[PDB]
Design an enzyme around this catalytic site. Structure first.
Site, short mmCIF file in Angstrom:
data_model
loop_
_atom_site.label_atom_id
_atom_site.label_comp_id
_atom_site.label_asym_id
_atom_site.label_seq_id
_atom_site.Cartn_x
_atom_site.Cartn_y
_atom_site.Cartn_z
N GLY A 237 56.62 0.08 108.03
CA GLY A 237 55.40 0.36 108.60
C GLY A 237 55.00 1.94 108.60
O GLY A 237 55.97 2.75 108.98
N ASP B 32 55.50 8.64 103.31
CA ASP B 32 55.98 8.75 104.71
C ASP B 32 57.03 9.77 104.63
O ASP B 32 57.32 10.46 105.90
CB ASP B 32 56.46 7.41 105.09
CG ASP B 32 55.09 6.46 104.98
OD1 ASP B 32 54.03 6.71 105.17
OD2 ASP B 32 55.27 5.21 104.78
#
Ligand SMILES: Nc1ncnc2c1ncn2[C@@H]1O[C@H](COP(=O)(O)O)[C@@H](O)[C@H]1O
Ligand SMILES: Nc1ncnc2c1ncn2[C@@H]1O[C@H](COP(=O)(O)O)[C@@H](O)[C@H]1O
Ligand SMILES: [Cl-]
Ligand SMILES: [Cl-]
Ligand SMILES: [Cl-]
Ligand SMILES: [Cl-]
Ligand SMILES: [Mg+2]
Lengths: 305, 294
Positions: free
Chosen positions: B42, B262
């Site tokens: 995530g 990320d």
């Protein structure tokens, strides 16, 4: 790939059972730690799965809705591989199927709140058509739970009109409180399901808890009051009680218990298989319990018996 | 189960970064066909995961909400193993975490959608953090009230000297509509000191002419340091009205760009926390992302 047989105006070459409800992706522990095997299951689907094994010469159909993604295709394929006719499956673009994960103490997590299957009663015409030449139509309380108010109405109206034309309607109340907005709604809707059904397959343990039945024979009376012609009350390791057109009885269940998952779903298939064969109810119940007994000596929802 | 160091009234022994958002269960193919390995991922959690690897000396905390079932407890244990402080996670009884299968997603009813349900808990998580990081996905999964709560807490944190970092991370499917998505992303920008947009996604939705236009859009919202990612191309930046570009060294044998953004974000924030100049931090971020995409 599944043989649908032939037909003329009057008869079909194969006996036809339709099961209606939700099939889910299932992830269950694999041999390698941290890993999981992708399979498919769901209460009404499991019953169809067992039926296809019991009568591979018959037409066992499944009605539901799936998405249009890879996983949905995979489910559709798994149905055909299992000998189940998924020709009526609705495709709901932009969506996917429901999924559950079994972790191992054994515990379940579910993601089915937005599944395509919740749209299975969106098309009234497709439902009627799926039922039209079915000898038996089978659904459950989970089938009712997942639908909204309009979906429930549509499904019940279809079952009721199918019933009137001469389709035999079979129902497993299969109480799962977590799928309903409230207990009041659950009990009311379950009995609406009963009112359109010829055969009902309640489980005493659950019925007692939510309806306050004093015993299995009270469970049977409750369904008979809703017009159910044949009530078969499953009762754990105890005798199965029945009530049919005013006549009562109990069928002994021989003592055998690894896994009570699939017990009820396999029992239902065994029962319906024998009813379709034109066997007396008591004979069908004995066959149902014999199958379930062999299944609960097995690993999983779908036990190759 | 993760040491958080010591403190006095004035300083803490560890620098502290808090990431806020949704961690999901991930099922990805194992070798044995038809089998999948369970992990956790995530966007904001991935950034936290990389940050923890980059600075073992620091406290990397994650704030979210999870369920009270076996899977939720596994997620908690995985965070701790990864060196992430999950001590602030909220538990929403009866709920479970979101899940995805490799990409198919089940996250519409995840406990994480309640992460802004307790305003005091959010504020406590941010107290004494040096940096607070969140994404446009963090905003997307919340309702209107949760969005207001989170943005107010972020702005109050910013007013007290916490540095706020934002990755817009545009994901159309998670929003009710295009308009809501763009307006809410810019509300996120309005509470952020550092923004890390990606030009490819921004251009499709905001009509930016080029990465400098993207940078300008974030600067007008009050963002002090805008770092615009653009795939394999140079990273443009805008800081207090000063423009610049930092090259991204060519990578040939590319394998998976999913975690690229990320990991870039973690690399950038790590170098910023170390007091390195922005251009240095961007180069460090490009270098890490480059390794990750390979
Ligand atoms: N412990 C058990 N021993 C023997 N048969 C069982 C047992 N549990 C379930 N069954 C069989 O599975 C059916 C389903 O029971 P139920 O689990 O109450 O839905 C029963 O009617 C039996 O035929
Ligand atoms: N094809 C690529 N070659 C080299 N670096 C890349 C590539 N794609 C992404 N990256 C790195 O990952 C960062 C974020 O990528 P993106 O968010 O997809 O724009 C970039 O700023 C680069 O540092
Ligand atoms: Cl339940
Ligand atoms: Cl002190
Ligand atoms: Cl998206
Ligand atoms: Cl600087
Ligand atoms: Mg380091």
């Amino acid at each position: 790939g599944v043989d649908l047989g032939t037909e003329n105006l009057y008869f079909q070459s194969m006996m036809h059972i339709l099961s209606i409800g939700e099939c889910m992706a299932e992830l269950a522990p694999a041999d390698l730690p941290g890993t999981y095997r992708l399979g498919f299951a769901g209460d009404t689907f499991n019953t169809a799965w067992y039926l296809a094994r019991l009568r591979p010469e018959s037409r066992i159909s499944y009605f539901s809705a799936i998405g249009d993604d890879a996983l949905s295709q995979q489910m559709r394929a798994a149905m055909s591989a299992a000998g189940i006719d998924g020709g009526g499956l609705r495709v709901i673009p932009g969506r996917t199927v429901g999924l559950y994960l079994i972790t191992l103490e054994r515990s379940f997590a579910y993601w089915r709140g937005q599944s395509a299957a919740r749209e299975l009663a969106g098309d009234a015409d497709a439902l009627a058509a799926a039922m039209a030449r079915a000898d038996v139509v089978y659904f459950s309380g989970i089938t009712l739970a997942i639908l909204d108010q309009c979906g429930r109405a549509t499904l019940l109206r279809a079952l009721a009109q199918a019933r009137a034309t001469g389709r035999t309607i079979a129902f497993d109340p299969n109480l799962r409180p977590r799928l309903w907005a409230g207990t009041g709604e659950m009990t009311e809707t379950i009995m609406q399901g009963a009112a359109v059904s010829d055969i009902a397959l309640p489980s005493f343990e659950d019925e007692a808890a939510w309806f306050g039945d004093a015993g299995p024979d009270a469970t049977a009376d409750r369904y008979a009051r809703a017009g159910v012609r044949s009530v078969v009350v499953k009762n754990g390791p105890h005798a199965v009680h029945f009530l049919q057109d005013g006549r009562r009885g109990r069928v002994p269940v021989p003592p055998v218990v690894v896994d009570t998952t699939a017990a009820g779903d396999s029992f239902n298939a065994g029962l319906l298989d024998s009813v379709l064969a034109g066997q007396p109810l008591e004979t069908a119940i004995a066959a149902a319990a014999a199958l379930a007994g062999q299944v609960v000596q097995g690993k999983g929802a779908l036990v190759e018996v």
